[PDB]
């Protein structure tokens, strides 16, 4: 009952950011904090000094040892780092620093790092390094899980996403006598546009093990619940550029609207670069998808595992209807978009499934099959395929029908 223990547990339940441990540590939210109204766990912070929160926290919890061990959680999605004036320019994030004692997260262009510091001018840092110059990244600008533990008799270490990526002894350091408070806030960030964005903040008053951590990956993962590429919740009337995650350097086209064209990978995706500061794939290309309501949706906005939807794809400004005939020859149905006035009785209902994956399915409930591609000739066509439904029965792995929708979003930047 791993975050019910937790000596700090900080949610946004109804309406206040609160800590549910046992200790209910005090919270004072500066004038510039933002929270997400999708999500309100997901918190903003700007590169201002009214964009903070602190935690007093109780005196019973405050750090202040050779020998305890203790670990921190929370998740964070920070924006490209677009400038020169990011490069060299550590700055703190969440600070326990007093008297030159203490823990601390801060950031740097490409890392994310943890510093302890004891009461006799000895430090440890474990990183997590990752590079802008890459064609489709896991991390940037995407929602990632952070793990920190530290066992006071030999390493701290450093996960993301459930696994180990740093380790470093901290048998180097002896009191740490960290602060009466938390301290979430920008200090130090020389770009006045920087942000972050952080959720499910947590301390424990022990070293978190390989396993619990998984667990609390998986557990926080709201895996009921579709996510965009950015790790966002995936929404209804939102469009998003498609990636197929089997072939990422392509996009979706039509070739003409109708039901004699047909739905296509092309590649490649251009690029877009700042020398010396990143150099990524384009992933505003192609014929935009939007989730459309049929079945689901009677409470929110959001799309969920098992809800019955339409795609509509948008083609030179315009919205079209994702269908097929299912009467077609062979296993694997062409995709086409259809004139939404005209789409008569194709099939066109879409089971979303949380990676995201569609299942269509005809009027009567029939599986049509799974969306993914199939090479006709040299032309990588959309299809609903069947195949892949037949594969997943037999637990054998699919290639093809997995997908990620990627929204435009600030922390991106390209145009
Ligand atoms: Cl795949």
């Known amino acids: ?154 390493n701290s270490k450093i996960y993301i996403n459930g696994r180990l990526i740093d380790q470093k002894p901290i048998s180097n350091l002896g009191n740490i006598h960290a602060s009466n408070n938390i301290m979430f806030k920008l200090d130090g960030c020389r770009d006045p546009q920087r942000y972050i964005w952080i959720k499910y903040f947590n301390l424990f008053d022990k070293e978190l093990n390989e396993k619990e951590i998984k667990d609390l990956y998986d557990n926080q ?61 384009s992933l505003y290309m192609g014929t935009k998808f939007i989730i459309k309501k049929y079945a689901s949706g009677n409470k929110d906005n959001i799309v969920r595992n098992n809800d019955r939807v339409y795609i509509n794809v948008v083609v030179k400004n315009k919205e079209y209807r994702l269908a097929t005939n299912a009467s077609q020859a062979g296993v694997e149905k062409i995709l086409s978009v259809l004139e939404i006035p005209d789409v008569g009785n194709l099939s066109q209902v879409v089971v979303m499934k949380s990676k995201c994956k569609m299942n269509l399915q005809d009027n009567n409930g029939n599986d049509i099959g799974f969306i993914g591609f199939h090479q006709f000739n040299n032309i990588d066509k959309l299809v609903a395929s069947n195949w892949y439904n037949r594969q997943i029965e037999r637990s054998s792995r699919t290639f093809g029908c997995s997908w990620e929708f990627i929204p435009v979003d600030d922390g991106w930047g390209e145009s």
């Open 1 to 154: 009952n791993i975050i019910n223990t937790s000596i700090l547990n900080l949610r946004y339940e109804s309406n206040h950011l609160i800590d549910l441990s046992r200790y209910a540590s005090e919270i004072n939210i500066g004038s510039k904090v933002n929270f997400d109204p999708i999500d309100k766990n997901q918190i903003q912070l700007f590169n201002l000094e009214s964009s903070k929160i602190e935690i007093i926290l109780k005196n019973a919890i405050v750090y202040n040892s050779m020998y305890e061990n203790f670990s921190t959680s929370f998740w964070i999605k920070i924006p490209k780092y677009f400038s020169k004036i990011n490069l060299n320019n550590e700055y703190t994030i969440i600070n326990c620093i007093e008297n030159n004692s203490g823990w601390k997260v801060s950031l740097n262009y490409g890392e994310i790092i943890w510093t302890l510091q004891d009461n006799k001018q000895n430090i440890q840092r474990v990183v997590f390094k990752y590079s802008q110059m890459v064609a489709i990244s896991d991390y940037i600008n995407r929602w990632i899980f952070i793990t920190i533990t530290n066992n006071r008799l030999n």
């Open 221 to 281: 993962s709201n895996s009921g619940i579709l996510k965009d590429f950015w790790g966002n919740y995936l929404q209804y009337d939102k469009p998003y550029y498609m990636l197929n995650l089997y072939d990422p350097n392509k996009y979706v086209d039509v070739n003409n609207v109708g039901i004699r064209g047909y739905m296509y990978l092309k590649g490649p995706r251009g690029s877009i670069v700042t020398t010396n500061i990143y150099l990524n794939s």
